Design an enzyme around this catalytic site. Structure first.
Site, mmCIF file in Angstrom:
data_model
loop_
_atom_site.group_PDB
_atom_site.id
_atom_site.type_symbol
_atom_site.label_atom_id
_atom_site.label_comp_id
_atom_site.label_asym_id
_atom_site.label_seq_id
_atom_site.Cartn_x
_atom_site.Cartn_y
_atom_site.Cartn_z
ATOM 1 N N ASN B 153 0.811 -1.207 0.000
ATOM 2 C CA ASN B 153 0.000 0.000 0.000
ATOM 3 C C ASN B 153 0.848 1.263 0.000
ATOM 4 O O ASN B 153 0.492 2.242 -0.662
ATOM 5 C CB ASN B 153 -0.995 -0.076 1.161
ATOM 6 C CG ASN B 153 -0.333 -0.120 2.504
ATOM 7 O OD1 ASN B 153 0.876 0.026 2.621
ATOM 8 N ND2 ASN B 153 -1.123 -0.355 3.535
ATOM 9 N N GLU B 249 4.292 -3.991 12.216
ATOM 10 C CA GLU B 249 3.108 -3.161 12.033
ATOM 11 C C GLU B 249 2.106 -3.995 11.254
ATOM 12 O O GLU B 249 2.268 -4.228 10.057
ATOM 13 C CB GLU B 249 3.450 -1.866 11.312
ATOM 14 C CG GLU B 249 2.232 -1.092 10.864
ATOM 15 C CD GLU B 249 2.583 0.049 9.936
ATOM 16 O OE1 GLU B 249 3.790 0.277 9.708
ATOM 17 O OE2 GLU B 249 1.652 0.705 9.422
ATOM 18 N N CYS B 283 -3.903 0.718 6.896
ATOM 19 C CA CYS B 283 -4.050 0.091 8.202
ATOM 20 C C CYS B 283 -4.613 1.044 9.239
ATOM 21 O O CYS B 283 -5.356 0.604 10.119
ATOM 22 C CB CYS B 283 -2.710 -0.461 8.684
ATOM 23 S SG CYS B 283 -1.894 -1.602 7.542
#
Lengths: 472, 474, 474, 474
Positions: B153, B249, B283
């Site tokens: 992303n 993450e 996210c």
């Protein structure tokens, strides 16, 4: 027979099965601790999870008051705890009373150190001008249920160094005292309970590594694992803890690099004290001497004298060398000594053994092929490795799979600083023995000697989560 | 047909086996990246282990100079990098250029922040009187080699956020660009190499996951894993790392707790702007709206209006809702939408699927039983949850498996602070959308959203060991 | 007949009267600066007070952008600024160019350090349980209008060491360039105006110390006095400021304590470089050698040998000693030399004067009766003082009325670290010469040598107020 | 008739003359304190100068142990010192006991705070590559002799807030207790001596201001002056200290800005509690109510009810309003009341005087032209000011000559945080009254209300000097 019982949810509980503890000096039946069942260990963690909120909902000063009361109760019972600690891990009686009082001091320092943790008030505008009006308030919150696993060598001191930094952080803790030394962890629990700490804030688990040992580590309530032990078990704990936060402090082969311009009498005294404190059964001990060939002979004679003046007997006579913790470890020490001795390493001190009690052995002329050069014994054995230059000393020191501590005895300090920066280790002591030191000092090991940073401030910091509150 | 190469030991190498990249927009052949082997990965790692000492030996300001040059070169080529990034991950062209700009700003800030790390000089006499003459000069040292596994992303921004805080600390890095987004990582490597970064301090590793994935992520020479990606893969990496340090993450399903005393227009704008950005594929995006039943209807009306104002189409038309990156992901969002439809959920926006191009779906009347209420779609679907109490809202928010970020939309900051301290999450944004934010801010996820604290200063401190030298101040 | 102007309210203004500047080496007309009157100083204060709000209301990143542009313009004009600086205060050309480059670097560091000033969020529950729900966001706000009074020794570096650390905090600056070196302060102002710094944020005041000298220090608009100079004027304006915050950087008598196990060749080179850089006219220079009796003869021989290699000439040949700044200082230094000479102190180096150009003189056998042992000369004179033990060395060093810095030359670092704790100075350099040093390091003088702590971080910190915003989080 | 003595070298001395202390309650006899001469002050100074090295030498655990014993003894004798304090300053008896308990808590916190003081270890790499191998160990050292002079308000608490930080920092202290409150300071010295504090590290100086005082401030051996009192005297001390460091806490008009949306019922209670604790005789009491005209009448009614609830009488029986400290202050407060009454300000509470006992006066319709709106009465009267906008309220609050603290009663914290940034005070309490607060929190005044930052950590850092020991590592 004295029967000890676990502190669970503020209450004392015995299990159906029990474990009997024997003195490592007399093999005398010392007491008995419960052997818990996976189900009884879940109940303890449910009690902890239920006590977490009202405990982290107190102010830091109230739970600091609880910690201070525990420290006072520990200090008034220094002889009662110390004598049975000495009986149970074969420690000198003055040494056992010493670690009880040092534990009280650690608890006080942790109580007043976790009481001053301040946050941050970051702003935004030095990064971008679109975020200039956004203040972020970065404080720190407890991880939750901290599981502390203590070693045998310091059952009161390393366990408390795990418990108190967790508790002051607003953080519920569960102790698993070692198999040899569970009575000491239960007496620490006795002090915590008499201090009046709420129910469920402090709990103990005793049992057998087969039944509840790996089950409590892989539990879901457990939010932080704090472990002290050896690398074989630390590797497992790191692998099966998952993504979960851990703090491991495993073994080390601390080296005493001795150079040309070095006060060899100071070096010899410090090296022997560090190497043979508690029979070498401590992780932060000098476990190999790397000395240049020029001063190696003088250092070897001085070390021989210092090692020769060491008393080897019973704990209650405050002997310098008391028997090792069990027979498996003495067998391991004897195997290392035999390997070194058959490969033509001159033993500067007599080699003898009366069961557990085995004499301090000082080996000289040690090469890269003898196992005593590489493996951590936890016994009164000290190899002396001779090298040609300081570069070879750095290479030999950095060839270990461990990295807690080191000593760099010398007289030039820009040279000691250079060497210290070149050593792949956590702490370098210049002109001194390696210590866990004042417990405000950071304590860590690199490579295969651990994960995370200990010390009161860093322990309090590590068992906590930061939370940002971002507004305008 | 463009063939990209791997920056290994300061030279561009290629493998005999290659992977082809197809744009998620048109499925056009977009380039070709190497698919290298176990041995080539070993060679790159050896190059980095050999490049450490001369780079750790540099002063902080010189290492910072290299990073500043990299940032200048990145600003130079905004359009080239941005167009290739927009083609490769189906991101808006204006937002791809914006990501490159934000990346350059990030690495400038990381350089200037990492050349400014101070140690402590603590004394022993406050602990005990026998240690009064004892000084610990406690400072910070590199870990060594860092893996910087990057997500699709943000292939440029979220790889630089791992690279720059590592390189300024004295570390050398392996960059493993994503499978879909590898060309963007190799272009970032182009910028780094052109900046004159020394040979072996920056290396890239492209290949098939089943060949050079778990291998590189468990090499003995790797000293730190820095991974952004999916929660399952993060679980596996926490498993495979061992006792080595990691930053993970992972995913998150951020909640927008909307209360009665809340400015619903601002909340609606923030919630849509957070949720439907890059088609829901971030996210830190709003993924749940938890609203009190008192104001839930007005909130739903405003939310519907602003979701309807959203543009669906081509990234080069700068559409708000561009195609999702996979057919597998498109099928995943479609399955979540189907589960919501079958279980009588009120869809407030049209449900369409023209290939990868999912359509922004606003679901109301979502309950605890639908999967869209508990799973991260990485797609443009936003459930609305209705609760009758703020305690019930907090309970519903804390039932999630993720703990990354959350918003509380209100007018009373005393109770907003109360709720924020009650939320089991890493960051709470009061009256604003969740975001990774000013990158100097800390960025973490509790629970299954990750391990470690990120942000520039926090990342510099993370990929670094403590070394204390203790001596007598006699 | 070049005429220089004052930057006030973003524009250039000249006054009715002027001050003519003469080169200290040729006495040749160098230009003229305005001789401002009191009402003009009031107008500069009023411009600053009006510019303070909009400057405070920017982002740190934007003020830093201004500072970076100024630093680039300074480094663009190295030779144009440096030639005039060398002509005006008789620095060497290489020294003057290096000074301008160092100021550029200082401005860049101060800019990037003013972006990272973080406040703390403090809780009350540690102190008492009645205040547990009470949080203080303690941040730092600008003090307001800072008046910087610069020295002649470094009229660009010790002026930008006050302006840049203040402008980044949000503070507006009024610069009072020195009398000799005023052309340099107005050349620094030109860089700030070409950078585009808003109008009123940086203003300059050149005048006569009788007309506008205590008027500017006793103004009501001034909120911080930042002064570098000699101890008498420092005493005056310290008493004269009142309660207002001050930072005084006064003189020093830095001692080089040399011990028996010292490396005397290294000690000699360090001592001579420190003592005779800029012909002794630095505050942070070795002004006396406290050598122990055993090694004193060998140290004196080495010191004599290295003081005999120093080039005594003019700036433009990059000589080591150039003429002192004016005739009054040369007269004062000559008086000190004559007193030492008549007190039977052996001069190891020839004693010679050609107007302002004094030859470096190395005095041995100096006692506490000679004024050169105690008074700061600001010229090329270095006494050597022999003592019997380190106790007498420490007593003699601490008998001075100046703190500032000291150098302990030895080989036992646990002895240097023990003597360093007994020395009443701000900074002890071990086996090295005294220096302001990396400007990130703290710079302070104790006793009569100053008030406050400089250094870029400490300068940014000191020119700000603390603002606490306690509220409830209940 | 008790005869009190001064502590010096751990021995109790008395002078020839002595000052008699009369209770402000009944003009009863409390005892006599010595009136020492300038020579006796010299002897106390010399005692401290001789005691300094051995106090500096011993470790922080040991000093902390002494401080902990003093705190325990203060806890022991709560009632004795409490009753004597209540008689001496007409403090409520429970309030006096509470002050002694808070004092012991402050002593303990300061002792534990002083142990944690940690130094920096800086490197030169990030500023210059040239000085990459240079390391500075930046630690903290005591100033020397600290002179703390206490106010009558809290002669035990605001005395200890100066003794304990200085004395844990390694400094020796000598206390000049107030003229009215000297016996309480001597009882504090009793506790310090009983704890076994070493001889000469804590000294006490009592006498007529016109003799020892001023001479006491001007002494050469005094290294830090820590004064709390009145602005006129603090300004003299700022002029009279010279270049020596000072920390001054002076008066203030803590404004209570009450806005449209403020919780008026909570604001009224907070305002009256703050304004009338100890009958207006605190520095950090809110002395001035700025309220918007639309909510002003309802606020005034609530304030009137709260003020009417207050009890006036004798310190025993715990009256909220007790006699003011002396007759000169009662006359000053009565003059302010007369001026307000003259210009048609409506009193909402009876004006009433019984010599020293004044009744609380709640004035409304107070304008810019009344003295009570701009002079600090240190007495039980607060004005209410009407403003038409928030900007007008901020302007009126910032027209004051004092900073210190201020309160913003509102409901929008984003608006309050904006008004807080524009209020020129040190601390701003949102929706609560002004207070010295958890003493861990920063306590500072910004304009004519003081110089320096207090608070326990800040006072510890203020009493000390920075010291660097820069050396080479490679």
């Amino acid at each position: 027979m004295t029967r000890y019982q676990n502190l669970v949810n503020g209450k004392w509980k015995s299990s159906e099965q029990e474990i009997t503890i024997y003195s490592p000096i007399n093999q005398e039946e010392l007491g008995t601790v419960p052997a818990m069942t996976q189900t009884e260990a879940d109940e303890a963690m449910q009690a902890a999870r239920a006590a977490l909120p009202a405990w982290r909902a107190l102010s830091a000063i109230e739970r600091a008051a609880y910690l201070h009361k525990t420290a006072a109760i520990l200090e008034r019972d220094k002889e009662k705890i110390g004598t049975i600690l000495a009986k149970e891990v074969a420690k000198g009686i003055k040494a056992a009373i010493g670690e009880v009082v040092r534990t009280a001091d650690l608890i006080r320092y942790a109580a007043e150190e976790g009481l001053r943790i301040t946050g941050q008030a970051m702003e935004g505008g030095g990064f971008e001008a679109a975020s200039k009006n956004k203040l972020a308030v970065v404080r720190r919150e407890p991880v939750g249920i901290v599981l502390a696993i203590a070693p045998f060598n310091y059952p009161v001191n390393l366990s408390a160094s795990k418990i108190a930094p967790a508790l002051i952080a607003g953080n519920v803790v569960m102790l698993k005292p070692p198999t040899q030394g569970s009575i000491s962890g239960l007496l620490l629990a006795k002090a915590f309970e008499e201090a009046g700490i709420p129910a469920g804030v402090f709990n103990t688990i005793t049992g057998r590594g087969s039944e509840i040992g790996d089950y409590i580590i892989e539990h879901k309530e457990v939010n932080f694992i704090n472990f002290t032990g050896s690398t074989p078990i630390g590797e497992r704990i790191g692998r099966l803890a998952g993504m979960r936060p851990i703090m491991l402090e495993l073994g080390g082969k601390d080296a005493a690099l001795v150079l040309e311009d070095a006060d060899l009498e100071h070096a010899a005294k410090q090296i022997v004290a560090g190497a043979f404190s508690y029979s070498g059964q401590r992780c932060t001990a000098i476990k190999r001497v790397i000395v240049l060939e020029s001063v190696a002979d003088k250092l070897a004679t001085l070390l021989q004298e210092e090692v020769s003046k060491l008393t080897v007997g019973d704990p209650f006579d405050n002997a310098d060398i008391t028997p090792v913790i069990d027979n498996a470890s003495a067998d391991f020490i004897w195997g290392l000594i035999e390997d070194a001795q058959e490969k033509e390493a001159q033993a500067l001190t007599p080699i003898k053994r009366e069961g557990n009690l085995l004499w301090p052995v000082l080996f000289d002329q040690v090469t890269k092929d003898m196992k005593v050069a590489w493996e951590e014994p936890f016994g009164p054995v000290l190899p002396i490795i001779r090298v040609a230059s300081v570069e070879e000393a750095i290479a030999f020191a950095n060839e270990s799979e461990f990295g807690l501590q080191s000593s760099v005895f010398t007289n030039d300090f820009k040279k000691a600083f250079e060497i210290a920066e070149k050593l792949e280790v956590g702490t370098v002591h210049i002109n001194n023995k390696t210590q866990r030191g004042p417990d405000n000092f950071p304590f860590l090991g690199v490579k295969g000697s651990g994960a995370g940073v200990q010390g009161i401030k860093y322990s309090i910091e590590a068992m906590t989560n930061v939370k940002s509150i971002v507004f305008d």
